[PDB]
Amino acid sequence: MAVTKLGINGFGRIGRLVFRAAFGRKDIEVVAINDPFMDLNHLCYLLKYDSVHGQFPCEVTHADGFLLIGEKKVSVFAEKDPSQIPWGKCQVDVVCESTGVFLTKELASSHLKGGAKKVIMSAPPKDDTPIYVMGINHHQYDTKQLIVSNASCTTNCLAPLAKVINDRFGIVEGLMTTVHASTANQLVVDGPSKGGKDWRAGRCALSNIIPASTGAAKAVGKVLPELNGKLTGVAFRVPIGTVSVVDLVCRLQKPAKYEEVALEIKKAAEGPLKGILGYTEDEVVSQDFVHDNRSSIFDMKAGLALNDNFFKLVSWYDNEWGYSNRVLDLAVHITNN
Amino acid sequence: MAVTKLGINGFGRIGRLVFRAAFGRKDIEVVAINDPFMDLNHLCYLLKYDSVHGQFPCEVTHADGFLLIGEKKVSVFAEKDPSQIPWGKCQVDVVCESTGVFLTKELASSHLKGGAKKVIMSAPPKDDTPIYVMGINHHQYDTKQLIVSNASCTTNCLAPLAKVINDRFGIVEGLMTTVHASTANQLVVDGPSKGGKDWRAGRCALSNIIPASTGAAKAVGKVLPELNGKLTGVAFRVPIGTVSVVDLVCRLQKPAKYEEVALEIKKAAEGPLKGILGYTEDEVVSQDFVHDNRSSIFDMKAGLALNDNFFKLVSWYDNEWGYSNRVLDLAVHITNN
Amino acid sequence: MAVTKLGINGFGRIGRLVFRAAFGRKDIEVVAINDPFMDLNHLCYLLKYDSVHGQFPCEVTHADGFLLIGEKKVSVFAEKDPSQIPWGKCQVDVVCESTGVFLTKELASSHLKGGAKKVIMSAPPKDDTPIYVMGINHHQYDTKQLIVSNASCTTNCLAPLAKVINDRFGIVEGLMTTVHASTANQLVVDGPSKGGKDWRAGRCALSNIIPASTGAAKAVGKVLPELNGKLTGVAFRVPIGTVSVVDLVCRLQKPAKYEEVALEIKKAAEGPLKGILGYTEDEVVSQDFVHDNRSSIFDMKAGLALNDNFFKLVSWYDNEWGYSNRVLDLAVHITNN
Amino acid sequence: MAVTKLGINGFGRIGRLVFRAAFGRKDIEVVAINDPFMDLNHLCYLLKYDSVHGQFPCEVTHADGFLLIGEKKVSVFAEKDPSQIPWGKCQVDVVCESTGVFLTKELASSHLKGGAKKVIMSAPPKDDTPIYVMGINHHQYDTKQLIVSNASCTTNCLAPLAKVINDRFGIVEGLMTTVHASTANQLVVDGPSKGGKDWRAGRCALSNIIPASTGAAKAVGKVLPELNGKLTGVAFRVPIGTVSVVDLVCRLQKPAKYEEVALEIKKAAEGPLKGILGYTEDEVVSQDFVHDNRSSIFDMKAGLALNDNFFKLVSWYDNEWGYSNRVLDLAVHITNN
């Protein structure tokens, strides 16, 4: 209805990609960025070159303390304290909280105190903060809610898949495994992970298949109450720049042939979930989804059925890119709604 | 009872590792090797240096056309036709068929025609050749069977896991996913796979999560009839030198707590299956099993249960090393039995 | 002057990229492709998806035995014998010989017998076949020469660098080292390289720094006679999808400051060699050049000088992309000249 | 003369490996370890499992706040302030300063204040702290010097190589390039490096060839005055667990054939520098030196000569393992001398 003004806290993989994903958009625009761990010179550099998604689609420069993207000026701050960021001065409608250390309503509030209208945590909340997944429950958003969560990359991939299958065949119970690409919280060589938590994530990322936990499957139950308590899963970190794959093993109430389930998913991908859920029958591999903007693409040939009620369903997702575009979709939605 | 004389056809990852794994052994010894794709000089080189398991634990040299391991002589041939290999002259009790292109009883017979007493296919058979898994059904071997199969690396990992769980809790149905390390049949850069079969395996192995199929789960039913038709699964090839991880999602007849299932497995690992099945509660990662000689090590902390009858069980395995030691165990067994 | 009709023999990394690089071009177009190791279905797949350069910028399909790129038809053959390819019927002005097994004038002749006007070997010749490097000696091409070589990726990178430095400061002698990205001739796991030649290239590409030889530096002397016998070097294969870096250590006749040499190169990159030689002072890394169409980009900050006559100069190059664009530049040139 | 008591500050790649390398030794033993970034439980874990060098050659456990290696007790501390570590109570003869943040005489002094007799910085000093390289100048050590530096992994590789070549042929000038394996100071995904220094090191380590600087070559001049000002070089970080390769391009005073230079090096490797400098003519690759305890192994076949005075010499080194063993050699030396 009118260009949404976005503010970004934490200019990392997600911060920068959300920024990159906004470039095309004509319904949203980033006007402010905050990150106390990079000078303006360092920030332009990081935004300009990317080891996964290529160089920035435009010229990046800075002048007088502003970030210059073509002929637009973006304010840049270096506040370690969110409450200290002049979001208000910049007329920020929504702040993309993507530092990964303010995942609670009390912590994410400081942005509102700084003048920001609303806030979106680019990760699962540690509080009972409302969680939303585009194309799944975003239409159940209440404008009075000023702080929300866009969930996790994995939840965004599994959620759509789960809804379609449950909606028609009904999911009795399911277990999920996601082979996930490398992430910023990992180490180059064997070392101690932060807070001595999840020791495995401190092991050399270059040569290991690394077991990790994830609440993505249980989170689905929060976005789809009908599924609360019917799903859970694990993760396996692998040495891949980007693109992860969800592997859902489920039991359905109503019997079906793999072909029928596949057909149902395809129908959703071309209809109501077009743009969120994708469908394919090609012999694809992770690299094929690098920079794919969908939340999840069903891989028909990769999955299979043991019998008429026990299935193994596979779906890919660019954990970085898809998620970043969704953050923008949610930002626009909760501002014009 | 008396040193088993082993012959190796196909001196590749498995051929060389079986050879390496025999070095310590005092009940078996390799006396002949055949591979028409490497001169003797090239063969010593490959056997001496290994990018995964380190250098050979002894000095490797050649003289007068023989392979010299210390002060032992090993005959070396370069026959493309198995029937042309003088196994008899070398008194070969068993031939480790590990070229991957003679996986049928008719094809593997040529070794018997060459003078070899018995043969073991280092891979699943394409015929109804008898399949054996150490510690699972090897005691059901019939001496009159001259050609057998040691199965696949994955089957050897999943089989023990399946038996213990089924034996006490009973497995109604199960689906499996194995994240597998890179393999010789893959390509360095995107290209056409052999015979235009399994296109995905021709995609760059360095940067892809590659979906692949596997009959390992169904094979379990062949080694454990009670499980025929109750298991199947898929694979995901990843960029790892060695070590794969089996991820079994199963439904049990009798309810149980994750702890009880874990306890049952541990009991087996320390008792009847000691040496085949391992157990651990440490925060491990793939690299931790490089060169582990067991067929499968249960990872207690990596798995979990959705409810009292739906479980996700994880077990690691060095696809190269463990399998190779098993080939030797089977070789000795079917020769002294 | 008029659209050049290109034929491609060997639809591999270079074949497909040359094809991809021609898509934009309005002065050249591919009308025929030959590769006996992929069915038409397999060929579309490989051309459509790429693990390095992304998906094809257009829809790829096939119908009635033709390759369909939008609404253009490209003939596709599967001849193992080059002389058997109907280049003439397709009016091929130039054939991009990129299979890597017909690098001699006698062998590359078969294309002329098939009806092709001229031929370009996408690699160094093993004969005294004429070698050309765009922007260096291509203007010394003789139209009566029907078979030529576009040289090697490394030569194309080093050649421009060498000319500029020699032209002004004069190179007395130089040694070069190129850290090269992985290549099709390498193996996923330790095995025997073809013909038992260059054993090192058969070692696991995923985890090794692999020493390899290269005539790229000596080749420079063939394209720049003034430098014959003044340069040579070695290579180091590393696990990188694409992008290699040339590292030239040279001694100049006339003294200079690193700044002056840098300035000279910059001058060439913005003047006479614009498009072939690039210049930069940014803190770049290999990934930054993925898909860069230049033959070599000088890295000012990466190099240095020991004294006024001994220098270490660094320059990057996308071994796949840049080279492929050059093949097109040469194809057009020798057809309209 | 009598078991040297070693203390380790910073239980990282080097800390743990020095500890691991001491296990066999009968002339030195670690009695204390300090690292405030890992609980005792976390420390045992990290010491027990290693993604590069395998599992610890003994059982690792902890009891009553001590590290238990078999039946030996090692005190463990978690002081962020070195001066606060009770080295004296533990009778520490030498402290292996390997945190990488106390590389100055003033900073490394705090250990002496804590009761430690002497100190060795496991890295190049930022002060004019004395630098020593085993087999090169360690016999010029003065017992009154309480703080010294064992130099850098690269210097330890290049130093021996340089001495032998200079001693007989004389090095006029030389430039060096080391392709180096990944290091702890690098990042898994593109991010900001510490202090905004060396931006390149913050780029994804998984997929980049990363240009880096190094004073290793100039440092050689400090250990070998005769070479001061005659050498310098650059580095290239690559995705390799461990093992780097030094590539020295040098000009000699006295002419020679590659064979003679190779012969000279071999002579040193088997004589005076045996154990420090290695020699080989095999087609080796980085993985072949994983866990090699030598400071540098000359690779005869990898190098070459342009003419009788201009050479390119290659030598490998396990940046982690060799260096760690050297730290122990120096520790014993300066305590019994």
Ligand SMILES: NC(=O)c1ccc[n+]([C@H]2O[C@H](COP(=O)([O-])OP(=O)(O)OC[C@H]3O[C@@H](n4cnc5c(N)ncnc54)[C@H](O)[C@@H]3O)[C@@H](O)[C@H]2O)c1
């Ligand atoms: N990378 C993925 O695949 C992916 C996918 C979906 C969601 N996410 C995530 O989004 C979040 C961020 O992850 P990321 O990959 O972008 O990590 P990242 O480390 O690349 O980015 C985090 C940024 O936070 C900055 N920061 C730290 N403290 C700050 C402060 N006080 N104020 C402002 N900035 C601060 C850092 O300097 C950094 O640039 C995580 O919670 C994670 O769940 C990541």
Ligand SMILES: NC(=O)c1ccc[n+]([C@H]2O[C@H](COP(=O)([O-])OP(=O)(O)OC[C@H]3O[C@@H](n4cnc5c(N)ncnc54)[C@H](O)[C@@H]3O)[C@@H](O)[C@H]2O)c1
């Ligand atoms: N690498 C693993 O992860 C793993 C684990 C368990 C089992 N296996 C396997 O065992 C088999 C062999 O695989 P690998 O990893 O050793 O592959 P590999 O490519 O390393 O070894 C195959 C060998 O076959 C040789 N060969 C080809 N044709 C021949 C012929 N006619 N006569 C004699 N030798 C011939 C080749 O030169 C090569 O040395 C496969 O079927 C596979 O299932 C592999």
Ligand SMILES: NC(=O)c1ccc[n+]([C@H]2O[C@H](COP(=O)([O-])OP(=O)(O)OC[C@H]3O[C@@H](n4cnc5c(N)ncnc54)[C@H](O)[C@@H]3O)[C@@H](O)[C@H]2O)c1
């Ligand atoms: N990849 C690079 O970085 C790079 C850069 C510059 C030059 N080059 C090269 O150009 C050449 C090709 O290498 P590539 O990387 O494309 O390798 P590739 O293996 O990817 O492609 C070669 C193609 O040749 C085909 N082929 C084999 N025999 C054939 C025949 N008889 N007729 C028709 N096709 C046949 C194969 O099926 C394959 O598709 C090499 O000589 C190499 O020097 C490669």
Ligand SMILES: NC(=O)c1ccc[n+]([C@H]2O[C@H](COP(=O)([O-])OP(=O)(O)OC[C@H]3O[C@@H](n4cnc5c(N)ncnc54)[C@H](O)[C@@H]3O)[C@@H](O)[C@H]2O)c1
């Ligand atoms: N990895 C190699 O290839 C190699 C080779 C030779 C030398 N070195 C080095 O030796 C040094 C250490 O590097 P590394 O690879 O072990 O890095 P690392 O990061 O693995 O280890 C450093 C340790 O310092 C600890 N630490 C931080 N602050 C501390 C404090 N105040 N007190 C005690 N401990 C503290 C960290 O927790 C960590 O365990 C570096 O300067 C580097 O040059 C590394």
